[PDB]
Amino acid sequence: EGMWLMQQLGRKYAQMKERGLKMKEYDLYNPNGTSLKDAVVLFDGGCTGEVVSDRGLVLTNHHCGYDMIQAHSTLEHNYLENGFWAMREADELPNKDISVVFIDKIEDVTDYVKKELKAIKDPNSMDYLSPKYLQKLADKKAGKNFSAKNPGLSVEIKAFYGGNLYLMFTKKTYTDVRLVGAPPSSIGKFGADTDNWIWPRHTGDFSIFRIYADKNGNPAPYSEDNVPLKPKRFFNISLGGVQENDYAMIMGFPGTTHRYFTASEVDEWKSIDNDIRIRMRDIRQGVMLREMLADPQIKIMYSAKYAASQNAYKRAIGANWAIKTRGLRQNKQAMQDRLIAWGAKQGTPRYEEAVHEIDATVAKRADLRRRYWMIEEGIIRGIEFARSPIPTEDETKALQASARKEAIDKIRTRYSKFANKDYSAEVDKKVAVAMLTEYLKEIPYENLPLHLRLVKDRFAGDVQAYVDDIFARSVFGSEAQFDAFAAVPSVEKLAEDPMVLFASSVFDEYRKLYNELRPYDDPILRAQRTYIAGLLEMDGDQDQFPDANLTLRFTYGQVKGYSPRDNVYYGHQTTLDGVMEKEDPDNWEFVVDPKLKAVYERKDFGRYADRSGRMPVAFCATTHTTGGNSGSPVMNANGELIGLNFDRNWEGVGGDIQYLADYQRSIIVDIRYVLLVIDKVGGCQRLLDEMNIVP
Amino acid sequence: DEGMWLMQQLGRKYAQMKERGLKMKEYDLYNPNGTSLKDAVVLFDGGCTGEVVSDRGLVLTNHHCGYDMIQAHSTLEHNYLENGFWAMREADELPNKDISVVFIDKIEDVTDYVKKELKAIKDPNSMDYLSPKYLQKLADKKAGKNFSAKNPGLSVEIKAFYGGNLYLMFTKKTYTDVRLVGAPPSSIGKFGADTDNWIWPRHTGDFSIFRIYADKNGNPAPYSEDNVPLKPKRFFNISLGGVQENDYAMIMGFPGTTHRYFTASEVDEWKSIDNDIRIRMRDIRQGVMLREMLADPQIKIMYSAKYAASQNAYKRAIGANWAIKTRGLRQNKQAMQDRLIAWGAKQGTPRYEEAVHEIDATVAKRADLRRRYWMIEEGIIRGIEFARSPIPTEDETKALQDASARKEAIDKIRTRYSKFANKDYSAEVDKKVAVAMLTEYLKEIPYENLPLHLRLVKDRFAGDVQAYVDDIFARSVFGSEAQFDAFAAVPSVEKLAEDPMVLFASSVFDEYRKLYNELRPYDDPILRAQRTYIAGLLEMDGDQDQFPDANLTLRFTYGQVKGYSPRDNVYYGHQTTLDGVMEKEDPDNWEFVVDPKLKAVYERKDFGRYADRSGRMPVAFCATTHTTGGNSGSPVMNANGELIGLNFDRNWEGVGGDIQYLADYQRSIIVDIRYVLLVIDKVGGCQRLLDEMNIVP
Ligand SMILES: CC1(S(=O)(=O)N2CCC=C(F)C2)CC1
Ligand SMILES: CC1(S(=O)(=O)N2CCC=C(F)C2)CC1
Ligand SMILES: [Cl-]
Ligand SMILES: [Cl-]
Ligand SMILES: [Cl-]
Known part of the structure; x- marks a missing residue:
């Protein structure tokens, strides 16, 4: 064991x-x-x-x-x-x-x-x-x-x-x-x-x-x-x-192991981490499979990405099966109840207080953690054009000297890495339309990355039109669109670029969520020091x-x-x-x-x-x-x-x-x-x- | 055993x-x-x-x-x-x-x-x-x-x-x-x-x-x-x-039913004709159905039972072919007939070896015809729903070419058309299944062996299976409800005689019956030789x-x-x-x-x-x-x-x-x-x- x-x-x-x-x-x-x-x-x-x-x-x-x-x-x-x-x-x-x-x-x-x-x-x-x-x-x-x-x-x-x-x-x-x-x-x-x-x-x-x-x-x-x-x-x-x-x-x-998880941490792992990863990866993999089966060239280009997404998807199905069938939650609850009863008999309330702290922290970070896994599974790893090029402050404060040519070559190198031999804009539009349809259903307007508000405001809820517009108007939507930008590059064009605004917007929200969630790790960690001390002093x-x-x-x-x-x-x-x-x-x-x-x-x-x-x-x-x-x-x-x-x-x-x-x-x-x-x-x-x- | x-x-x-x-x-x-x-x-x-x-x-x-x-x-x-x-x-x-x-x-x-x-x-x-x-x-x-x-x-x-x-x-x-x-x-x-x-x-x-x-x-x-x-x-x-x-x-x-006294040649035929064709054609058919059922929940409702029904004998053929490949089915039939042939030689009775030879020769002789029969049966007769679209009878056609029997013939044809294009029939799903099924059929069966209407793929459509299937539905009286009602309002026997879906359905059913009728005479020699073969096996081992x-x-x-x-x-x-x-x-x-x-x-x-x-x-x-x-x-x-x-x-x-x-x-x-x-x-x-x-x- x-x-x-x-x-x-x-x-x-x-x-x-x-x-x-x-x-x-x-x-x-x-x-x-x-x-x-x-x-x-x-x-x-x-x-x-x-x-x-x-x-x-x-x-x-x-x-x-x-x-x-x-x-x-x-x-x-x-x-x-x-x-x-x-x-x-x-x-x-x-x-x-x-x-x-x-x-x-x-x-x-x-x-x-x-x-x-x-x-x-x-x-x-x-x-x-x-x-x-x-x-x-x-x-x-x-x-x-x-x-x-x-x-x-x-x-x-x-x-x-x-x-x-x-x-x-x-x-x-x-x-x-x-x-x-x-x-x-x-x-x-x-x-x-x-x-x-x-x-x-x-x-x-x-x-x-x-x-x-x-x-x-x-x-x-x-x-x-x-x-x-x-x-x-x-x-x-x-x-x-x-x-x-x-x-x-x-x-x-x-x-890594999580042998001293509370029952509330097992519920969170199941209902946030695992359920979101399972739900979003099934939408993503489902669209990839349809496209790979219909085009042998799409199968060549997307086989490794499909397999890489399936790895943790399967892990999550296996983990959720144990939570459901092997009583993982109940055994953690029995572990903490036994320590709480022993602490009460000894006159030491710090163990029950430590478990309560972990539960309260888990309950408090629930909406934020859900929003983090939703954007991470749904957009950050779900949509390829989320990782499309974002011009640096040095690159824009170079476009508006022959340092314009150096900036365009740095942006072009990043654009070639994004739109590579294995990237299909058509497959990515289809994956994004299904992934965003689910994301917009789970995350409300007030909690959306700023650019995703345009789905309701500018496109009347048409996710397909919003995604079509990103590719139709973006300098990263096609090689011809990029070359036309590279010939006449203006910082004003980059600042209004629909794909750049999408990529920046989703990465802003992803970092804002991460930074808001980080302070919640410490109380759990400190309470785990008292909790594990309690378990060791009791059972050895x-x-x-x-x-x-x-x-x-x-x-x-x-x-x-x-x-x-x-x-x-x-x-x-x-x-x-x-x-x-x-x-x-x-x-x-x-x-x-x-x-x-x-x-x-x-x-x-x-x-x-x-x-x-x-x-x-x-x-x-x-x-x-x-x-x-x-x-x-x-x-x-x-x-x-x-x-x-x-x-x-x-x-x-x-x-x-x-x-x-x-x-x-x-x-x-x-x-x-x-x-x-x-x-x-x-x-x-x-x-x-x-x-x-x-x- | x-x-x-x-x-x-x-x-x-x-x-x-x-x-x-x-x-x-x-x-x-x-x-x-x-x-x-x-x-x-x-x-x-x-x-x-x-x-x-x-x-x-x-x-x-x-x-x-x-x-x-x-x-x-x-x-x-x-x-x-x-x-x-x-x-x-x-x-x-x-x-x-x-x-x-x-x-x-x-x-x-x-x-x-x-x-x-x-x-x-x-x-x-x-x-x-x-x-x-x-x-x-x-x-x-x-x-x-x-x-x-x-x-x-x-x-x-x-x-x-x-x-x-x-x-x-x-x-x-x-x-x-x-x-x-x-x-x-x-x-x-x-x-x-x-x-x-x-x-x-x-x-x-x-x-x-x-x-x-x-x-x-x-x-x-x-x-x-x-x-x-x-x-x-x-x-x-x-x-x-x-x-x-x-x-x-x-x-x-x-x-x-069992086939315990199959020769090794009958096991090879069962594998390479019956099973391989059924596996190949049903995989194409099921593959197209699955893509359409997954993309439309209403297509899943309409095609779920047809998909399941096709999968039944498909799985059985996979299981049967696994046994032929891994359990030595062919070899044990060969050992059974070799043992009887050796015993017959020792007794001075050649009729058992002659009976096995008859079965082998019949199996070898009917190979191309049997392949063509399973190809049309799995590929078109079962594979394509508009193969079973309405074909006007000799008396239905006659009634259309000066009495109140014209409205009787149109009501009989309409009843059959409603059974074909029912609540579970999708013309779009059928065109997609037919395009993939016919593409495979045309690759396996040569021009000289094709149902007469399928010759139009090469002759009239320059090999475009999609254009041929599109034309059948675009011009047929059974291509849509509106197309049928327009025919029913002004019905002419000349229109039915040139109808692309009627010509397709008649043509594939002609070839299916021509193949069946050519293959039927080959069952009897095998049956008669099996009487001698099983008699030998029983006289030898009991x-x-x-x-x-x-x-x-x-x-x-x-x-x-x-x-x-x-x-x-x-x-x-x-x-x-x-x-x-x-x-x-x-x-x-x-x-x-x-x-x-x-x-x-x-x-x-x-x-x-x-x-x-x-x-x-x-x-x-x-x-x-x-x-x-x-x-x-x-x-x-x-x-x-x-x-x-x-x-x-x-x-x-x-x-x-x-x-x-x-x-x-x-x-x-x-x-x-x-x-x-x-x-x-x-x-x-x-x-x-x-x-x-x-x-x-
Ligand atoms: C989704 C499953 S799986 O595909 O068998 N899978 C195998 C790899 C890792 C897992 F955890 C589970 C049925 C449970
Ligand atoms: C992949 C298989 S199957 O084809 O699904 N199988 C299903 C049951 C009936 C059969 F005959 C065969 C397990 C072998
Ligand atoms: Cl050493
Ligand atoms: Cl065995
Ligand atoms: Cl004899």
């Missing part, structure tokens, strides 16, 4: 041992010595990775190394669709703007931070959560010249439990991380968008990198003279596999984990399937047979790599097939993961790598508020399938040879 | 059924010379199956089986289709016009009789051995002089089995006063609606209740206010013990593990209550529960609305004796029994012959089961009798129905 601090391993070890953990406590996490924790990395600031060899070889997800695979892909060498397999270390490709972070040391600095905070004076100061304040405290504790005296190292203090616990992290950052291997996109992204958040899953979501360092193993930026890093710890790869009920554990960097930091905050956590559970609906069971493991079942050569998402199809046909599975002779692909577990856990190592009872976490099922997206024991599963790619692809698809024996594989 | 057996075959199957869990005595299930459970099975309304469940002629069948009767008694005041119907006294049970219930009184093997009569051969190619007229003349000869008058209510029928190698005479008792007694609301009776059609897991309460009425002596009689409920020879006991995984289950019913094709006659099937794995890592269990209904609830979707009385029963856990050991309320179960169309409403029996459910469907992974049964995929979808009795009790409040049934603990 939790994403536990490394400090909490001692207090959990007995339960983990009872659940099947066989390895020694300090072999997994040692606060003053080398442990498995030392083989886990924060890959590129978002994902998780793991060192799997004495030469700094790193495994992470395909979707984690995707941008690096794309940056090295050309028409001649398409590594994104064909995969990449460096046959020698010298062929491994460097990547600009990449990093891996090791968590060298972690220390509890709560009493230190709390004593330093006593000098605040203002009781409403948000410095207790300030990265700038906490960094000044971190520097004070580590030393004046710490990073110079210890090169490659850095320190960081973070708040936990709403400001009730502080930890200082000593981090080692490496920035020369080279691409080593990757399967074709047909394996690394088999499900593509259709199987996103879906279990059963048949995706071989992996990519291989290598950490490079100076001659002494110290961090260094890219240099042709850099040598592979020899790390203090790396994972052994297990080929024993997984069985139903086997103990499994994960270490990674989960980003034992069965209630601190919210995820992009810091190193461990989670444990078992390899186990689940029943999604009545009379249906999804088992714990997928096989290569499921990939072949899903094959569709006329659907880009489900095309099967010919080399992999041949391996399956010839049953050339080597030492990677299971006891039944079937080739495993992926498995699922009752571990508690969220975003940030992509690429996380999955370990055996002995701490051996059995897979890489790459997703979680949709029935568990509400797991960031309330973990769902009977539905929530981590979707992991089986390490045996990883090695099978490296071996039989990539032919990269050198990678297999440098890993320590156990029978 | 795992058959639909003749009642005659129960004797030689009994030992296997007993070993599979059957506990009842052989003759208690079927006895040719006495009362048996077979006597409680009926052919409900000529298509479905039913079963007598009380000593007062109460009958259970499916909701989709009694649907037309429930609809005929429904008005905007007493809507029985939407709210259900529960007659609180026998006098309140509603009579139904044109309904029937057929009992199978006796069944007799008349093979030697028919085969001896057939020896009086005028031609060895005579198809009389399969002729309903010929076999009826033989049936009447055996039964006697005016049998129907001497034995009222009774009738006799001879049917061919095993391709003409076995004949059975059936003595049938027909009752035509069958009254509606009870029915759940449509929200239960068709819970899945079209979404869950052919789907397992399934949560549908597919049942309806009727009653057989007869004269004072229990003899068949048409509706009369003086008719009294039938006291039957035999009725089923209802079991409340339920079902468990692996339990023995059996069904009796009237499966309609009528023991190869059942005769279904032909709308009484059959039994047995298996077990068992689920299956549809795909990797997914298991569908053997039983659905009331929780699955509540999980599927969607108040803003007519298909998944949950009846308020039922939702509260679930909330209250008011399940009585109808819940399982764990306290869960069962809804439906599935079994490895071999069923097909005609088996809707079939009784499902226990090891003891007690009613445990009613068959109402089969899963799509098993639609290829009519050619080859699929042990690991094919399941009969049955509504649990405990859920039937729960709905009668807690939703209908009809205690009198529960009281007249014999329910066992």
Whole structure:
């Protein structure tokens, strides 16, 4: 059920041992010595990775190394669709703007931070959560010249439990991380968008990198003279596999959770955040689908935007299903009622007062938050011409010297980015007409962005006429209209431009709403400090984990399937047979790599097939993961790598508020399938040879 | 494979059924010379199956089986289709016009009789051995002089089995006063609606209740206010013990058609002509309908039923093609014929290999014609609504070219025009469907093979299908109401003879009939060769593990209550529960609305004796029994012959089961009798129905 601090391993070890953990406590996490924790990395600031060899070889997800695979892909060498397999270390490709972070040391600095905070004076100061304040405290504790005296190292203090616990992290950052291997996109992204958040899953979501360092193993930026890093710890790869009920554990960097949400925050998340996103994205996607189906060129241009909009749309449907069916609201209400009853018995009213504060803040910001999500989903992300060019003060105070020509070239560059190869003005007019019709129905005249008042005032409520007029009269309505403006540019024309007035107007309202809503975050945050303090003083930091905050956590559970609906069971493991079942050569998402199809046909599975002779692909577990856990190592009872976490099922997206024991599963790619692809698809024996594989 | 057996075959199957869990005595299930459970099975309304469940002629069948009767008694005041119907006294049970219930009184093997009569051969190619007229003349000869008058209510029928190698005479008792007694609301009776059609897991309460009425002596009689409920020879006991995984289950019913003795060439043809054309043309048709229904809520109202009707056989063809592709249907037919050919060679009898060769040669020879037939049938005859636009008859045309019969001909044409262009017909949607359907048709069928009017696309319109379709509506008398009324005011035969829509409709129907008439002669050689082929198969392996094709006659099937794995890592269990209904609830979707009385029963856990050991309320179960169309409403029996459910469907992974049964995929979808009795009790409040049934603990 939790994403536990490394400090909490001692207090959990007995339960983990009872659940099947066989390895020694300090072999997994040692606060003053080398442990498995030392083989886990924060890959590129978002994902998780793991060192799997004495030469700094790193495994992470395909979707984690995707941008690096794309940056090295050309028409001649398409590594994104064909995969990449460096046959020698010298062929491994460097990547600009990449990093891996090791968590060298972690220390509890709560009493230190709390004593330093006593000098605040203002009781409403948000410095207790300030990265700038906490960094000044971190520097004070580590030393004046710490990073110079210890090169490659850095320190960081973070708040936990709403400001009730502080930890200082000593981090080692490496920035020369080279691409080593990757399967074709047909394996690394088999499900593509259709199987996103879906279990059963048949995706071989992996990519291989290598950490490079100076001659002494110290961090260094890219240099042709850099040598592979020899790390203090790396994972052994297990080929024993997984069985139903086997103990499994994960270490990674989960980003965010909302485990201490009040019932009023769950109602708000449902009725504002989720309902608006679901409603507006359904209108948007519905118009895009009609147009993509009727024009193959519109399908080419809008496919990525349609898919990108569907991602959080699906997430919201999954989250709303949990709120409706799993009693998320009720369990938060039972949590706060229990604390309020305990606080009454103790004579301490501050907990009930803190919950009341959160409820009152949520109730007070309701109309503003609704208006914010309405403009964000409806216009800011719903209508493409909302992001059309807005002339800067420097650009207008240049049009009215040959600085007119420089201003027009800056505006033209922005206009070409807006109206690009994938932009259709006709599709955008249709999307805007349906999105604005819904927006104008939900937001009243007095609350409208100033230009949208023209729908009622100038166009007699004709949204189609208003949108037609924007394009017919705007200098950004067509290339010919822009070139006619660029030939005779007047600031007066730009000041009255219907598209510029629309774009400026909707961005004014969006910022006015954001700035009005920001002050409401602080009272909730301060009240959460008292609320979480109350929950911990009552039931303890034992069965209630601190919210995820992009810091190193461990989670444990078992390899186990689940029943999604009545009379249906999804088992714990997928096989290569499921990939072949899903094959569709006329659907880009489900095309099967010919080399992999041949391996399956010839049953050339080597030492990677299971006891039944079937080739495993992926498995699922009752571990508690969220975003940030992509690429996380999955370990055996002995701490051996059995897979890489790459997703979680949709029935568990509400797991960031309330973990769902009977539905929530981590979707992991089986390490045996990883090695099978490296071996039989990539032919990269050198990678297999440098890993320590156990029978 | 795992058959639909003749009642005659129960004797030689009994030992296997007993070993599979059957506990009842052989003759208690079927006895040719006495009362048996077979006597409680009926052919409900000529298509479905039913079963007598009380000593007062109460009958259970499916909701989709009694649907037309429930609809005929429904008005905007007493809507029985939407709210259900529960007659609180026998006098309140509603009579139904044109309904029937057929009992199978006796069944007799008349093979030697028919085969001896057939020896009086005028031609060895005579198809009389399969002729309903010929076999009826033989049936009447055996039964006697005016049998129907001497034995009222009774009738006799001879049917061919095993391709003409076995004949059975059936003595049938027909009752035509069958009254509606009870029915759940449509929200239960068709819970899945079209979404869950052919789907397992399934949560549908597919049942309806009727009653057989007869004269004072229990003899068949048409509706009369003086008719009294039938006291039957035999009725089923209802079991409340339920079902468990692996339990023995059996069904009796009237499966309609199977193709178990198809050659590999017939499976290839079924796939590449029948199924591929139906899939291709229906996808074009449905695609255009969907775009129009989504853009106009009034077009959704008008085209919803046509869209759903087209999707039905479309989905079935997708499921059938999946089995051909994944379950080795072709290969198993090839292995069947290769094995017979090898055995025939060893015996010195070449007639079996010659018979298979005949079938293959006929299939290869009719390929282009059959492709052209399915192309015009799926593409135009079904695909385009103005293909069924009015065509003036020879006598209608004649009446227009000097009497008061001109106004009679115009009123007949107007009546047909109003039926074509009705409240659900949109000329704009039809022009769009026709433009896409004809574009595909013209791409597949060459100029020399086109219906004569479709040649105008190339000749007169320079290949512009949109212009050709636009011209048909712009110039036709049936293109709009105003165009028709202008014709009706000044009707000339010359105008009708040149009408572009009339010429299109006539032209496509000419080609459709020319193709049908050319293809008909090819059925006979295949049929005659199948007589030799099935004779060989039976002489080689026996009528023991190869059942005769279904032909709308009484059959039994047995298996077990068992689920299956549809795909990797997914298991569908053997039983659905009331929780699955509540999980599927969607108040803003007519298909998944949950009846308020039922939702509260679930909330209250008011399940009585109808819940399982764990306290869960069962809804439906599935079994490895071999069923097909005609088996809707079939009784499902226990090891003891007690009613445990009613068959109402089969899963799509098993639609290829009519050619080859699929042990690991094919399941009969049955509504649990405990859920039937729960709905009668807690939703209908009809205690009198529960009281007249014999329910066992
Ligand atoms: C809309 C759904 S989905 O498309 O299955 N979806 C999958 C991806 C993520 C989710 F959260 C949900 C039925 C719930
Ligand atoms: C995509 C499919 S289907 O075509 O909707 N299916 C529906 C039920 C009847 C069938 F025969 C097939 C599931 C296979
Ligand atoms: Cl290291
Ligand atoms: Cl012979
Ligand atoms: Cl099978």
